Amino acid sequence: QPAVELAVFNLNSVTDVADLQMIASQVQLYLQVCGNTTLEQIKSKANITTVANIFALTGSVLDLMLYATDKKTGDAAVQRGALLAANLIGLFSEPNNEAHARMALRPMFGLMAECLYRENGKIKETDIKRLGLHLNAMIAGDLENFLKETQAKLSSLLISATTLGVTILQSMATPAAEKRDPKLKFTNWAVPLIDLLGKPSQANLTPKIQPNITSRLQQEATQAIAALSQTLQQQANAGQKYTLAWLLQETLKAIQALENTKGDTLEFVSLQADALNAPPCEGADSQSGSISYSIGAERVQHADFYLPKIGFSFIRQYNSQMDEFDQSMVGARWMMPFSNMIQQNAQGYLFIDSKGRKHQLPVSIIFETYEVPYEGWIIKPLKNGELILDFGGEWRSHFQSFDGGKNYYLVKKMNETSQEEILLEYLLLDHIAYLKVINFKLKQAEYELKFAFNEQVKIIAVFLDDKAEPLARYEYDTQGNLIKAIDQNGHTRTYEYNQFHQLTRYTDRTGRGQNIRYESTEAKAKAIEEWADDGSFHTKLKWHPRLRQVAVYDAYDVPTYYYFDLDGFTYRTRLADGRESWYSRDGKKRITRQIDFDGRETQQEYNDQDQLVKIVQPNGGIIRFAYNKQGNLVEIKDPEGSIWKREYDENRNVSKEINPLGHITQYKYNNDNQLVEVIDAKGGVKKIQYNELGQMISYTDCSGKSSTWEYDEDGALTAEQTANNKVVQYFYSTKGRDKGQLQSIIYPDGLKEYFEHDEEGRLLKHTDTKGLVTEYKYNQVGLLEQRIDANRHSVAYQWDKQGRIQKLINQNQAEYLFGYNPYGYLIREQAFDGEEKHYSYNENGRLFQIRRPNILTQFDYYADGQIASKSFTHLHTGQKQTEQFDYNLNSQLSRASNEVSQIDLYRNALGQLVREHQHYKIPELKPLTAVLHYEYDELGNLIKTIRPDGHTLNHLVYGSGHIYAIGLNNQEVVSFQRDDLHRETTRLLANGLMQTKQYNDVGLLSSQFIQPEQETQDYLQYQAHRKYHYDKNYLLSQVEDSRLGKLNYQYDPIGRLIAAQSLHKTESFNFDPAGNLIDSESVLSPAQIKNNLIKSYKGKHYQYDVQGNVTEIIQAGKNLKLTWDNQNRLIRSDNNGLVTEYGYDVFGRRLYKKTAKELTLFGWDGDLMIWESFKSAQTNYTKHYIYEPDSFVPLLQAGYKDFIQLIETPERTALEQFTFYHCDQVGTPQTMTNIRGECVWEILQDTWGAVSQIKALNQDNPFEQNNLRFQGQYYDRETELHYNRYRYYEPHSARYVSKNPIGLEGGMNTSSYVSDPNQWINPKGLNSFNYGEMFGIPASAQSGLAYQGQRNYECYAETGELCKIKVPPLFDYVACSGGGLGIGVGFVKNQWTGEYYISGSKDSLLIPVAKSVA
C-alpha cells in the first residue's frame, strides 16, 4: 500500500467543510501534544501571507506537522515529500499572476500520485481525461503545454515551496477561510484554521492520527526546517520514483503513448471526516451483496407478511448500529413499518426514517418549518404540538409526543387528496408508548392490524382483523433480541446475536445462514466480515484509518476500494486491476458526470429549475430535454436530431405522443392514473380494464379481441382467458414449504403442470403435463448444483466462492471448466471436448483477445465500447481476416465490412432501416451493390420492401400490424384470414389454392387442409391435408398425411425424438445422455460421445480440426474435405475433387457459392435470404424467395431467366414463373405448386433432413427446384450439407459440422441441431426454438412459475433518489406492460447484430448459458 493515500474528488460535490474541520482538529491536537500550545496562542506570531486556497493550506500544514514529527524513510519519505511539495506549491503567493496556475496544478499532482503511487499503477486514459477536464475547468489551456511549462518551472516552484515551508515552520519552532479563491490572500495562516474549527460541522472531529507522544515540538520543527530544503530540492529529480518530477515524466510518457459543464475541477485531502450517514443509494457501489460501505452498519430487511389489497408489506429492518431501538417492541435494533420517530438528544431532535437513516434536526423545528438537504422532504410543526412530515407525495405523517415532547411517535398518516389515512393506537404504560393497533382506513380496504405482546411487551403475534391465524409470530431471547420470525406462510427465519444485540447470523426461510462479524461489541462498531455458512462470498471490510475509504476483499482476497463522501455517496471505486469508476456530483448531489471502469463517460446537465435538460452519451451523442411551464417533459431530442413530442393531461399523465415522423399516439387514463385507452396513429383503439386492486382484468386490442384475467379477492391470478375463450387456471400451495406459491396450472385441455418450490422460491420439482418430473438441487449457499431431468440424467454445477461458475458437468460427465485470473475475470474456458479458449483484456477491461487452439481473435473498440473491428489471425499459417464496424450516434450499426462485402445501413428518424446497401466484392466477379428499400406504416410495420433488382414486396396490414395480404409488384400473391388470436386460419394463394388451418385447445396446429378454391377438371390441382395428434406433453405423436400416410413418432422422457414410423421409412434414433446421436447399431461404437464430436455414424467417418470444425467426412466412395476460415466458416469444400468456394458477409450471411465456372450469388434481407442468382456459360437465372410474415417459412419463389441486375459499385425484369410452397407444421417445405395449382415438386426427406427422394415434374426447370429445407436451411448439392446461416448442418448425423458460435448460450451440446425436429427449428444455427408451440396458449402464461407482481402500495415512505446512478434514457417511460401499450424514444426496427459475438467473458446463467456471445 502507498505510504500516502489521497481522496481526490470533484470540487463541485463538496458543500460541507467536515474534512477541513478534521484536518484543523488534527493540527490542533498535534500542536497541543507536541508544543503544548493551542492555536489561539500561536495565532499572534503567525503573520504569513499565502493564497486563499483552504485545501492547500490545510494539506500543507498537516504535511508539515507529519514531516516534523512523523519522520519517514525510503519510498514513503519520497511520497510524503512529494505530497508536501504539491500542497505547498498551491499555497505560496509570490508570483500572484501564477496563483491560479499553481492552484490548478496541485490537484493535478494529487491525481497523478493517486494513479501512480499504487503498485502496478499507471496513468490511464481516464486519468488523462480527468486531468484535462480539471485543467480546462479553470484556465482553459492545454494539458501537454501546462505539464511541460510546469516541468520547466518545477525548480522555481520547489524553491518557493521550500521558502513557504520554512516560513510556516518558523512559527511553532520557537517557544512562545472557506473560500478557494486564487485572487485572495490569507493574512495569517493559523487564523483560517481557528475560524474553521469554530463552525458547528455536525461531524465527529476526533483526530484519526495519534501524535508521536514525545513532545519534540521545537526540536522536531528545527530538524524539519533543516531537512526541508534537501527533501524538496531532490523533488525535481526525475530519476527518483514517486516524486513530482517523476509524476510529470510518467504523465507525459502516458500521454505520448496513448495519443497514437466548464470542465470538472478536482480537489484532494489526506485526512477526511467519518461518513455522517449511509447514502440513500442501495446499489453494489454503496453496500455489500448487507454491510453498508460508508458506515459499516449491518442491515437486513425481512418481510413477514403482505397485505395485497392495500399493497402493504410488513418490513422488519435490522440495523446493527441502531442502539436507539434497543428496546424496540419487535426486537432490539429492529424497526417495523411506522416505527420511525423523533427523539430528543443533546444536539436537538433526531429523526429516524423508515429506511433507518438518521437525520439530526434543530430544536427550533417545533416552532418553524425545516427542510433537509439532498433529500427534498420538509418537516413543519403544528400549533397542537404535532409535526407534519412531507416525504414527497400526497402523504403527510403526523407525530405526537406522549412524554414532555421527548419522543415523538407516529400517531397517524394523512393522504390529503385521496382522504386515505392510517391511525396508530398506542398503549401508554409508565409514560412509555407501545403501539397497539394499526387502522388501515383506506379506500382499497379497511384492515385492523392488532398486536399480541408477551410479558416483556414484545410483539409475539400480529393479527389481521378477526382472523384466528396470525400473520406473523415472533420469539425473543432473555436479552430482548428477535431470534425467530414466522411469516404468514409459516416459514421461519432465525437470528443469532452476541451478548450486545449485534446480529452475528441469520437464516433465510430455507435455513441458509449468513454470518457477520464486527470490529467491536460497541453499538457504533462497523461490520468487518461476512460470509455464507459454507464460506462462499466471504467478504472482509477494512476501513481506511484516515480517509472515507473502505477496502472490500472478496472470497479470494481480491480488493475493491470504495471512496464515499461525507453523506455516504460512493463517488469513486477502484478495482484490483487499477481501473477506476468516478461519479461527479453538483452541490445538490446530482450526478453530473460518470466515467466508468471501461472509460465510458456520461454527462448530465441540469437547468436552474433542477430539470435534466441534456445527456451526453459515451459516444458523444447528445440527448436534449425540454419542459413546459408545468415541469412536464414535452420534447425529447435524440442524438440523431430526431424530436419526440409529448403532451399531458391535468393529472401529469402523457396523453399525446408525437414521434419524429409525425405519427400521433393518444392515451386515456382513469381516476387511478392507470392507462385505460390508447389510440394509435392509425386510429386503432385498445381498451384496458382494471379491478379495484388496480390489476388489469381485461385487454381489448384494436381489432376488438378481448382477453381477460381473473384474480381472487386477495389479488392472486386465478385464471386468464384468451380471445378465443380458452382458460388457463392457476392454483397455489395451501401448505408446506411453498405455501402461497404457484403450485399447479390447468391448461384449457385439462392437463395439469405441478411445481414445488422451497420457502425462498427456488424451483425444486417440476411435473409436466405428462407427469414427468424434473428435479433441481441447490448447494448450501443456494446456487443450483444439479438438474435431474425425466431421463434421470443430471447436469451438475460447481461454483467458486464468489458464486461464479467453476465447472459444468453435462449428462455424459464431461466437464466444462471456467478459469478466472487473480482479478476474478474469466481468462480460461475448457469445453467438453477439451478445447481451451484463453481470454485477455485491454487496459479498459474489455475483452481484448480470444486465443483458441488455431485462431487468435482480437477486438478493437470505440471509446463508447462498441466493437470497432475484429481480426482473426491463424496462429500457425498467419493468415488474417478482419471486420470493421461503424455506428451512428444512437449506437446502431451503420456500416459493417469484411474482405468480400460492405454493408451500409440507413435509417429514418425513428431508427427504422429504410435503405441497406450490400456491396459485393466477390473474387473474380466485378464489384456490384445490391440496394434494399423499406417502407413502414404509421405503426412501424414493414409494408413495402424493394429488392435490389426492383421487385417490390407489399404487406397489407390490419389493426396493429397483422398481415392479411402479401403483394408482389402490386399483385396479390396470398391473402390471409385470421381468428380471434390473429392466427392464420385460412389463406388464398394466387394459384387458386386455399389452405385452412385448425388449432386445438392449447393452440397447436391440429390440422391443415389445402384444396382448390374452384375445382377444375381440366388439370389435377393440388389437394392435401395433414392431421396432427399430440401426446400429453404436446409432442407430435402422429400425423395423418394425405400424401405420406400416417406418420408415427415416439419420444424419450425429455422430449427427444427417438423413433419415426411411416410407410416410406422407419427410423430409430439412439441418443447419448448429452444429446449426441450414437451408432448404437455398431457394437464397437462408444455408448457416449464424451467430447460431443462423434467420429463415426452409420457409415460416415468424421475428422475435426482443433476447434471442433469437421475438416473431412469419409464414407463409401465419397471424400468431402472442408476448409474453414478463421471465423469457423466454410470457405472451401472439396467433394471427390470438385472444389466449391464460399464467401460470407460480416453477419455470416453467405454471399456466393462458386464451383468452377458456375457462380451462385445470394442476397439477404435481414435474416432471410431473399434471392439467389445463378451465373454460368449456359444458364443464367435469378430466383426470389418470399416468406410468410415474420418467419423463416417460405411462401413462394419467383424468378426470371437472367442473372440479377445490380448496381455497379462506384427497367425491372418481369418475373416469369411463380411457384408456391406448401410446408408442414414446422415450416419445412413438402411440396410446391405452379401458378395453376398443380404439384410440380415433392420431397421425401428423412427425419433429420437428409433427402430420400425428390419428385419434380420439370427436372431442369430451376424455378421449380427447391433447396430450402428445415427453416433457415439451404441444401447444398455440392456437399449434401444444409447451410444454416451461421453453421452448416449435417443431416446424416443430425448435427452441425462446427461448434455453436455463441457457445453454451445456444445449449449444453454446442453441436446438436434440435432435440425434436417435428416442432423445433433453429433457423439461424445459433439457438433452437420450439416453433410448434410459438402460437400456443401454454406459451402465454402470465405466471409461468414465479412471474407474479404485487406492489400496489410502495407509498408510505419514499425519498426520491437520482443521486445514486446515471439515468438511462432508453424508452423514458414505457408506460403499461402486459398486452403492450406504451412507447417513446429509442426503438430500432430491423435490428442488426454487429458480429453476433460482442462479448463472451460471462458465466453463471443458472439455466443453461455460459457466455455473453450474442
Author numbering: 14 to 189, 204 to 287, 305 to 333, 335 to 1255, 1280 to 1483
Give the published text.
The type VI secretion system (T6SS) is a molecular machine utilised by many Gram-negative bacteria to deliver antibacterial toxins into adjacent cells. Here we present the structure of Tse15, a T6SS Rhs effector from the nosocomial pathogen Acinetobacter baumannii. Tse15 forms a triple layered β-cocoon Rhs domain with an N-terminal α-helical clade domain and an unfolded C-terminal toxin domain inside the Rhs cage. Tse15 is cleaved into three domains, through independent auto-cleavage events involving aspartyl protease activity for toxin self-cleavage and a nucleophilic glutamic acid for N-terminal clade cleavage.
We mutated the equivalent two aspartic acid residues (D1369N, D1391N) to asparagine in a single construct (Tse15NN). SDS-PAGE analysis of the purified Tse15NN showed only two protein fragments, compared to the three observed during purification of wildtype Tse15. Indeed, the 22 kDa toxin CTD observed in the Tse15 purification was absent in the Tse15NN purification and the Rhs domain fragment showed a corresponding increase in size. The identity of this toxin protein fragment was confirmed by mass spectrometry peptide fingerprinting, thus confirming that wildtype Tse15 possesses aspartyl protease activity that drives self-cleavage of the toxin from the Rhs domain. Unlike wildtype Tse15, particle processing for the cryo-EM data of Tse15NN showed only one main monomeric 3D particle class with the clade domain predicted to be retained together with the body of the Rhs cage. Tse15NN particles were compiled to produce a map to a maximum resolution of 1.77 Å and showed that the Tse15NN quaternary structure is the same as the wildtype (RMSD 0.860 Å over residues 14–1395, A chain). Clear, connective density was observed after L1395 and the sequence of the toxin could be mapped up to residue 1484, guided by a difference map as well as the unsharpened map. After residue 1484, significant breaks in connective density meant that the C-terminal of the toxin could not be placed into the maps. Overall, the position of the Tse15NN toxin was similar but not the same as the wildtype Tse15, and lacked defined secondary structure features. We also could not find equivalent density for the helix that was present in the Rhs domain opening but did show the toxin peptide was still in close proximity to the end of the clade domain.
